[PDB]
Design an enzyme around this catalytic site. Structure first.
Site, PDB file in Angstrom:
ATOM      1  N   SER A 295       0.796  -1.251   0.000  1.00  0.00           N
ATOM      2  CA  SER A 295       0.000   0.000   0.000  1.00  0.00           C
ATOM      3  C   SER A 295       0.822   1.292   0.000  1.00  0.00           C
ATOM      4  O   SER A 295       1.562   1.482  -0.941  1.00  0.00           O
ATOM      5  CB  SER A 295      -0.946  -0.096   1.188  1.00  0.00           C
ATOM      6  OG  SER A 295      -2.069   0.705   0.968  1.00  0.00           O
ATOM      7  N   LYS A 320      -0.576  -4.516  -3.304  1.00  0.00           N
ATOM      8  CA  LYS A 320      -1.834  -4.088  -2.660  1.00  0.00           C
ATOM      9  C   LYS A 320      -2.080  -2.595  -3.061  1.00  0.00           C
ATOM     10  O   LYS A 320      -1.662  -1.667  -2.401  1.00  0.00           O
ATOM     11  CB  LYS A 320      -1.699  -4.238  -1.144  1.00  0.00           C
ATOM     12  CG  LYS A 320      -2.978  -3.897  -0.420  1.00  0.00           C
ATOM     13  CD  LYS A 320      -2.888  -4.231   1.064  1.00  0.00           C
ATOM     14  CE  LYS A 320      -4.210  -4.084   1.781  1.00  0.00           C
ATOM     15  NZ  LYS A 320      -5.256  -4.932   1.212  1.00  0.00           N
TER      16      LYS A 320
END
Length: 386
Positions: A295, A320
């Site tokens: 992320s 992600k």
């Protein structure tokens, strides 16, 4: 049109307006709405919630989920007080079979202390099979009062027979976002080309949270002042977190240029770029990442790489790269909807692809404690970072 139907429509509209893919996974979104209104029972609240979940499912995006009132409230308070977990961040398998896996273990948390590693697959929690369940539901099973225990059965990535059963004790977990040090007498192998000093600055960035920025600023500042030959930014096992702190960190290292694009089916929706507030954009830098880097951390890594500001070393990151928003409904329930995705300055998705190292290295060779790091970097067995 009933009250229950209006509530359903609120959820349908939230997706209609904000969903990342305006083709809706190949479904006619308005048609669905009309069909469900006509064919789905929505006599009581409970049926309406089921109809909302059924509708979300057709998108085939396990991160897009419905949250009932109590759940949404709990999600909100999060792991603050009285509510504790076992130091696991979870997500779905990267090739997603709806397998739930450990994204990253929190440093020094229960699960890490019990040997869990990023990539381990969670089989059951307290006997319950978690495959395909909502992550909100899975966390609920993992959380509870401090000192209470929970059983987690895990296996090694791609080794379902290689399992372990852990009895973890729930406890507050406190991750210190930033630690740093100067490593002296560094092995030649570990230095950047043309180094004039055998010293490296090491910065361990373990999480992006409210305290990260101020702490990272102090570290880069100090290090720069020391005149270190190179900087080693360690974001292994960093699940991301506060996106703005990742941007702030990137801004400390890069003087100009795009850092991340925010995209969806329509094209680029937003961009974050360098703001000329660098602290250090000249010292050679190497960023350490692994499969637990995800992320905001991947976004950081991808901006550093694309901009050529730093080298990426270790193993490829998680991939992600989606962004969700939670849309509140009139009855206190909510929908978590995937609205967008992160892309590198070069326009490549972070999702699925992740960020690949320029220097492939065993991600476990270097420790993360300041003492151990200096030890290994001064060794005859120093990784060739650069």
């Amino acid at each position: 049109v009933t009250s229950e139907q209006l509530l359903f429509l609120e959820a349908w509209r939230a997706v209609d307006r904000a969903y990342v893919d305006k083709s809706f996974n190949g479904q006619s979104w308005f048609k669905l709405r009309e069909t469900y209104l006509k064919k789905e029972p929505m006599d009581r609240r409970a049926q309406t919630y089921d109809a909302i979940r059924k509708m979300l499912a057709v998108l085939d995006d396990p991160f897009t989920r419905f949250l009932e009132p109590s759940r949404l409230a709990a999600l909100r308070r999060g792991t603050a007080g009285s509510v504790t977990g076992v130091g696991l961040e979870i997500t779905y398998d990267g090739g997603s079979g709806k397998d739930v896996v450990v994204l990253t273990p929190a440093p020094g948390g229960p699960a890490e202390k019990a040997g869990a590693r990023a990539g381990d697959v969670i089989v059951t929690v307290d006997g319950t099979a978690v495959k395909g369940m909502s992550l909100y539901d899975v966390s609920d099973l993992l959380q509870g009062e401090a000192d209470s225990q929970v059983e987690v059965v895990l296996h090694a990535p791609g080794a379902p027979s290689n399992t372990r059963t852990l009895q973890l004790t729930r406890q507050k977990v406190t991750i210190n976002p930033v630690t740093f040090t100067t490593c002296s007498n560094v092995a030649a192998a570990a230095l950047p080309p043309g180094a004039a000093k055998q010293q490296l600055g090491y910065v361990r960035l373990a999480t992006f949270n409210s305290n990260t920025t101020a702490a990272a600023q102090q570290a880069f500042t100090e290090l720069s002042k020391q005149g270190v030959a190179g900087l080693v930014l360690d974001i292994r096992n960093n699940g991301g977190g506060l996106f703005p702190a990742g941007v702030n960190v990137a801004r400390m290292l890069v003087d100009r240029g795009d850092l991340v694009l925010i995209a969806d089916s329509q094209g680029i929706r937003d961009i974050y770029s360098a703001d000329g507030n660098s602290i250090d954009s000249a010292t050679p830098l190497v960023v350490l990442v692994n499969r637990g880097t995800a992320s905001a951390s991947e976004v950081l890594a991808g901006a550093l790489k694309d901009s050529k500001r730093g080298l990426i070393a270790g193993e490829r990151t998680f991939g992600k790269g989606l962004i969700q928003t939670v849309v509140d409904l009139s009855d206190g329930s909510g929908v978590a909807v995937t609205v967008a995705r992160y892309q590198t300055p070069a326009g490549v998705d972070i999702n699925k692809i992740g960020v690949s190292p320029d220097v492939q290295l065993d991600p476990e060779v270097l420790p993360t404690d300041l003492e151990g790091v200096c030890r290994v970097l001064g060794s005859d067995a120093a990784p060739r970072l650069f």
